[PDB]
Copies of this chain bind each other. A is one copy, B any other.
Amino acid sequence: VIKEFMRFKVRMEGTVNGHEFEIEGEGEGRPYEGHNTVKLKVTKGGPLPFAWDILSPQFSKVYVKHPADIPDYKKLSFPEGFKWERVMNFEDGGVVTVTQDSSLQDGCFIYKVKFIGVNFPSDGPVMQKKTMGWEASTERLYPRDGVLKGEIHKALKLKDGGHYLVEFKSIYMAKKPVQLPGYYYVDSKLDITSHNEDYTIVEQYERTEGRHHLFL
């Protein structure tokens, strides 16, 4: 079902401060190694009048490398798949909710994303495109309400120095109740590997792996 190498296609429909847009992409990676890349294209509403960085994390948790003793809830959910939703609370008031469906079709993962971002200050980092990528991050996960949940304290690097803080709250829901893991963590590092002048064509790379707390 989930091969050593897997490709995926994604489509996002979103709005940010009243500006609607569409994005289509194709990616690939090694689900058991914790690596995956993706190439995106703004197919509608481009060039985007905000930082591409807020969208990069919405474009693969099935590719998270999991140790044998931590049930890989997301991988187990296939072939049916899972859905995930998320809240992004930015420190200057901006708020985003995301809903996504992940399925398996013709040997390829299919991602469907709906994005709504609101309340971003007009002179803030997002609308002024002053961000420079995310710092590597660490997610705290745990089972609840029959599904998997996780929170992350993330940060975008600012062009003029400093950080722009964003709290991530995600909900991973398998389409069939498969084995859930316990309290654990997932380290991720997402890099923008290429981009044209106006970010209408972008490529990303993500390394992500789950683990127990260094149990210090």
Contact = CB atoms under 8 A, between A and B. Distances in A.
A138 B185 contact: yes
A196 interface: no
A216 B137 CA distance: 9
Given A118-B171, A123-B145, A171-B119, A207 B216 contact: yes
Contacts of A152: 153
Nearest to A16: B99
B121 A145 contact: yes
Interface stretch (A23-31, A72-80, A89-97): A89-97
A118 B89 CA distance: 13
A173 B187 CA distance: 28
Contacts of A183: 135, 155, 163
Interface residues of A, number: 57
Contacts of A17: 85, 173
A119 B187 contact: no
Interface in A86-124: 86-87, 91, 93, 95-99, 101, 114-119, 121-123
Given A85-B116, A97-B97, A136-B214, 13 more contacts: A17-B85, A18-B85, A87-B118, A91-B93, A97-B116, A99-B118, A115-B116, A142-B155, A142-B163, A144-B163, A187-B213, A188-B216, A189-B215
